[PDB]
Amino acid sequence: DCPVRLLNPNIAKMKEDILYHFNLTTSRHNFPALFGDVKFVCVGGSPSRMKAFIRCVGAELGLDCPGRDYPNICAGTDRYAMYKVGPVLSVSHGMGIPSISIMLHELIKLLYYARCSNVTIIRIGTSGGIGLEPGTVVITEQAVDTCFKAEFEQIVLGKRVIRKTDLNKKLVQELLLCSAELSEFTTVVGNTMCTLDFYEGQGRLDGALCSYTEKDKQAYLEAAYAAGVRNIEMESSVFAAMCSACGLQAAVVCVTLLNRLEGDQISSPRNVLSEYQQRPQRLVSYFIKKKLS
Amino acid sequence: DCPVRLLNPNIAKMKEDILYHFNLTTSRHNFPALFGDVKFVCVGGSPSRMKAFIRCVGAELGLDCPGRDYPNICAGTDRYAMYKVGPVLSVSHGMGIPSISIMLHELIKLLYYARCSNVTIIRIGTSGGIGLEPGTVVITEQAVDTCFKAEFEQIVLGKRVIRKTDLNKKLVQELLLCSAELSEFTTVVGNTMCTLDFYEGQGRLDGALCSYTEKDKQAYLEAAYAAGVRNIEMESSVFAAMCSACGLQAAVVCVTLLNRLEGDQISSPRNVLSEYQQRPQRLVSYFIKKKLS
Ligand SMILES: O=c1[nH]cc(F)c(=O)[nH]1
Ligand SMILES: O=c1[nH]cc(F)c(=O)[nH]1
Asked: What is the B129 CA–ligand 2 centroid distance (Å)?
């Protein structure tokens, strides 16, 4: 019903397209036959988390056959990993705007060549909370910049280009509904601030560099909280400004690993942090199951 | 002689430090005993490229003993891989400014706790060339922004903070020296433009998004060429801005994978691309064997 579209008049004249970072080529691969049935894409930082995600949702849908694995569709490259089970695609994206950008440029063309339509895309990951207990799942209402505005800036040919961040409201609602049914963890809906640096960029005091005080930070965070911000991470803004523009329905679901009003160090036991990081997976695999039933 | 320093008062007050992304902590690890003897750090995108590097410099230094390999010091995470042979450290950094910044904050802190001094740090990578044949090695004179200036801008508590990019001039001459001795491939010195996006960020026409034309790309790449730029990549600017400020001598050495005046697609056969990628490694590992002879 709603096809994945590119916003680029230069693609039609190309004889082939090398998705360099995926190690996939329009000449070597039957894209419509490989990926044409994709309806749900889950993305996150880590290749192992994304394979775990693909195993878990394969089980949830019961396409989980005994023994056998989900091959890395991008095995051979080491930039991104990719997995698939029925209409679900799993894709790692590393850390930061540039890393997910490259993945998203290539994934969106991949889906376009595959002539995919009605695609829901969900980012799962981790974040720092503002005024939330650690381990809280935040469903992102708006992906915002460091002014707390629903905007994404990039430089194109030396000029600053402002594009809007848009996450699907209906999708936000569906995921919230799912979480109240599950009732396995605190879930909130808030704005998510995207940064280009984890230390000075997130107002941390424990970096190799720090140009400000404990109270400069505290007052920036409180300002953020007042403007609707509930968490902080590194990939939401570019994700929200590309997916919508290309006809994907996008959501972001992150767990908080700490409350940033109370500290900076991520000091919880490994096991606790591990339990926290299952939570976006749990919510999103359950949501996919509920949508495909 | 010259110690690795931090530009952060809050670090001495701290009782313990968790290097979250390395899975290293002061409370579990002996930093001087682990890393005190490190004099050279080589950084690059991929874990497997950085393992191949430690093996190569190991061989070069004659510390290549029969059979055994190099344990990943950061095993148990998948953010960054890290390897050591004698006084050389090898650390991967993934893709983009944010990925390498996180690595750099925690790496500099790691060198500090280890009481390291006289540390030379080199980035080896890949890049798109401007007016150079594919496979040319570029030693970066200045890491520049998208207006061709030796500055790195980040946002700190909502505010634009501009720092200078500084790459060691003597180090550039030393690397060039080694290249003239080796005489195994074309080596140029020039400026490197760091970008936040591989497609539109670098004036490519083949992204999922493109508002401009061939003529626009061409004029922007020419303007860059006239301002000293010979190659384009994604990590040099934050690298150049952080390393020197913290008392490390920094260099960037990238091979070009294509000539951007001629195209955007990376269509060289895989084996050709591999040969190209061994080149910065060849030069840097030889530089290191030379400094330690
Ligand atoms: O970008 C972030 N990711 C995860 C965190 F815990 C955090 O504080 N910031
Ligand atoms: O950032 C880049 N790395 C490698 C390339 F070939 C290129 O064009 N751009």
From this structure: 8
